[PDB]
Amino acid sequence: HLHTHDTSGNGIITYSAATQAGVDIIDVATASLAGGTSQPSMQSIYYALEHGPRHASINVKNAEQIDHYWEDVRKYYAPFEAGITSPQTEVYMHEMPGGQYTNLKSQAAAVGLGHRFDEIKQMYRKVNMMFGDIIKVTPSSKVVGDMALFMIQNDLTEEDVYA
Amino acid sequence: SVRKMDRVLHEFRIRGVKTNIPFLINVIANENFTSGQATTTFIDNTPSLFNFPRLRDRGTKTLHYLSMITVNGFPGIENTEKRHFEEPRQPLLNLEKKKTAKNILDEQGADAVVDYVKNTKEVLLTDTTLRDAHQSLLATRLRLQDMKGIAQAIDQGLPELFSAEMWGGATFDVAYRFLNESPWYRLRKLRKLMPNTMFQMLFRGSNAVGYQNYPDNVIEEFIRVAAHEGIDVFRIFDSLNWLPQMEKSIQAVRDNGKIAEATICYTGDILDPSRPKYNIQYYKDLAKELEATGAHILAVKDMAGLLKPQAAYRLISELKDTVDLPIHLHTHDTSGNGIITYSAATQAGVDIIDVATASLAGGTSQPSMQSIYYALEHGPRHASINVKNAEQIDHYWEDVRKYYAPFEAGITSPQTEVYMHEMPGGQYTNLKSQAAAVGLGHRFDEIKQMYRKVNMMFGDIIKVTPSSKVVGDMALFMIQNDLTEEDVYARGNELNFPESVVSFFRGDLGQPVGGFPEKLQKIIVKDKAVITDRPGLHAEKVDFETVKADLEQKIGYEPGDHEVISYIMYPQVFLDYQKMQREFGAVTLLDTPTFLHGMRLNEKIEVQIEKGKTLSIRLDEIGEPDLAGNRVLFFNLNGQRREVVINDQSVQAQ
Amino acid sequence: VPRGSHMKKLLVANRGEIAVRVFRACNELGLSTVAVYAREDEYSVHRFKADESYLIGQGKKPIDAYLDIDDIIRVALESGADAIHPGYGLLSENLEFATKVRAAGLVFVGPELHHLDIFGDKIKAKAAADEAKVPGIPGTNGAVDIDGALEFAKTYGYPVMIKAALGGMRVARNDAEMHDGYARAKSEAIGAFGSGEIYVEKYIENPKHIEVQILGDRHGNIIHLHERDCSVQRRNQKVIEIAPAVGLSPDFRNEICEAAVKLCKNVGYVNAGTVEFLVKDDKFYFIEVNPRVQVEHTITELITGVDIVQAQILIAQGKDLHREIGLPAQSEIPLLGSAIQCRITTEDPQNGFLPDTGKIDTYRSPGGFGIRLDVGNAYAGYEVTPYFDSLLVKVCTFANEFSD
């Protein structure tokens, strides 16, 4: 059972590749709550596979109809939208899961470093390597974040930490 | 002594009463005065002393515009209060110097560009961020002021690009009509900031960027001026894939030394044997004809994002075996399948694909530039782009996009129903507005459904601007008046069908594939004139001398060739643009948040109105409206207090 | 005459009253003008008096913005200016600046690099005065260490004046103050002026400060425009200046003027400069050359009829003082009554002359016969900031008789 996020804009193609490799089950979200840092779309992967050797099992017309409800409902949550839903390939560099990204943005705000968030993404990556190259998912991802923020806040390099 | 007087007279700043200073200035300029020989009858006998220039005032038009928007809002969006925005991020680039397609075009010509493309192993990219991406996502509202802040970084940072699509489609009239800025100014400004990037436009074969029926000489002149002003690549299409409407444009682009892409619009589904009208043989036969026109490159325009990946692969592989021209594929990511379709097309040998920067990608835009790079990175064929530079540049666009919140269509996400109704993006949002204005918003799903039925009733047609509007107007009309398809055939003689539908069936958009359904055509057209040849042949003759003199009279100065052609394309819009320039001045120079929202109390802005002239403007007070709606704002403009009266419309319309 | 001396457009690398003074001269000479301004100075009058203006030194402290050599040159090149007038203060005596201006192909309205080098350094300037046979003040051979300084005080005695080469100065009355004085001045030298070299002079008791206005062209003409008495000082800072030196005899004044001319002829001085002397009981001693226009040039203009700033610009254009600029021979240089200049500032005399800040509510300036105003930043509604000097307006009066 494979689970990915569509943060890079490569989620559908990755699921289609996994399908041809014989994956049994994939995690998809309804179109109107899909893409960006969510899962790839359920309805999309149906149609990517439709004319191939292996199909997705879903009533796609019922799913499209259900998606209308979710589209309408999502508008209620405008105040909580992280920002515009679009691909972001820098994830390959920093490797933050979505929540570690928005949280880390809040934390840098509440300590007045919002204006250097790109240095922080960069530090997150350096911290990860400093710690041995680790798996970053909650809460290990927070460990890496707290450290990167701390290091920027107090102006330290990797040399500085060892010294 | 005279020079000092002249200096002092010009230096005086007196406001609130008139003075005799302009008269004094004239007297001391005159040689009777400066020679010392004036007599008591000199002034009384020199009429040239009583001619005074118009005292020029860009400051005052600016305060008028800022007051209008501050108090009354920007037309057609919510009159809200202006957010504080940081400066958009600037990219940190790692520059690599390379020869570009544009350098080859300029040095060696179009056929040498074609050879460069044929010899490239990687898939090449065209960036749509400056045209199609915002046309789809932001109602074509993206402003020059935002484009020019990043243009040079794109030119230097992304020299691998085949071209940037930056003109045509809806940008031409939206610029004039809604942004109060010239599309030609946009082209000149960007052309200078991006000297090594080919500039691509979308060009409708029959009428360039307009929607009337223009004669051939107009289309040829448009191409001449566009090519002279810096358009390198013309993507020529026709809304019904009707080659006679494309032929002359292709030849004129060739004659002007530029690159012509001849376009096929994709519709239907080549992999559906129950829909043979637009099957693979259809596309190969049209491709062969387009190749014979002498077009440099074949474009496949999937305007609705219908192409699924196994169909992309079959389509491209077959076309590459059919013609020798490079193939340039254009899709939309509306279904969420755009990247996988481009990857399929890449494996089939596609030469160039259209991509948008990530922050303006997805949804009804193009697939992401940065994404396709990483999809292909570990494959047999890569994308040619500096991806790290592209990621840095995307920061700027991500910041700039926030300014355009009032124009967002809604949340950017996949929507697969496009396979069913086949509306291109704009046809979808428009058709939603139109149904709103007539109080049918609550039945928009029945309308998507009717759009699909109308398409089949009309014979199964290619739906791109303006044929897509034809299908939309009809579907709306049919829902509004409660008709089924039976009803139209039964009671059509006594119904008045929408304008666009009648024009379609009169042949005013050209001839469609397979002709019209005959009965319905009779029903619809009634006693109007039907043509079956190229509409351009019937166009009112146009004399550029006559038009230029008429226009000069109308605007009060000698119009350049670009203005004359604008006026011909969009006469009333061009004239209305002129009136807005006269009232509000060059609003193009305002930062986007100020352009849309005006100013907050105690805000300071800086407007760069020329090189070496900046207006520092601070809003000190916003007066309450009196009963007639008069409000008085007090600004500080460059150290002076300025009192500005604006009428508060909400009081007027109470 | 340097290549490229023709001018259509001039940029002032300065702010305030002196920038407005240069723009007025430019406009009268048919030149278009360019201003530069720091962000914090965005409401300065000089920004709006120019034909075009540009922000400089983005993100720097305001004084550093006006010392930003490359950004100023950037603007000059971007605006298409021909020439930079450096005004006074700021970069006007700065060799590096003038070098880079001229290296960027622009006319620097001022003297030759060599003159900025020898007159910008007060040790070098004394050496040039000896060489020209102009009496100086007994001082150390060159720059000195604390031991060579103490030596001087043994040779000539106290009190003594400790001065930085780039002033920047302290009086020493004894050994304790010599150790303290040398330290404090070597601080402010590496501090506000960048370098730490130091020399010592005999301190003269109750001198007058007399200075002579010079103009030199590129055709070997040099003239003086008489002298100015700038003795009215507070803590060695000029407060009121008068012209001519009405308390000295004409003969003695002429002698001072001739000595200035002698020095300037010796070094081939070009453009406007001033030679400064201390005067005590009918002797005079060279102290300094300011190789630039001075704040008090105004009163010399009033008593001679000569527009000094227009002259500077015409000189830089390669013109001849006599044939083209139209100045008479030395003995025909007018001497018309007298003139006095005061600088009205926001310095509060009841609060230790700390400059006041805040909004100017009311500003009504007098005029009439015998009054000249050269305004800085003073107009109703202007906010005086703490970032710059405290000048509001320079007032000069002039009349036939000193008492009037």
Added chain:
Amino acid sequence: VVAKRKAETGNPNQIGATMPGSVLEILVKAGDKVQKGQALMVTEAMKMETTIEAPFDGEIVDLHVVKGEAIQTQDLLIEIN
């Protein structure tokens, strides 16, 4: 006292009264086409007569005064498009 609509500052489509006085004669009406310099109405200040001329070619939008009406400085007289 209901205030009169004022002409917007810097708006060349709106012609405001330059001095207090009154309206003697109106020569045009809503909808009329008009040319630069054409006389639109006549006003008085201290029984001196001024003729209001059209600043450019255009169509009259509306009048905001009536014959013999009193006016003060800035009052909107006529709007043009």
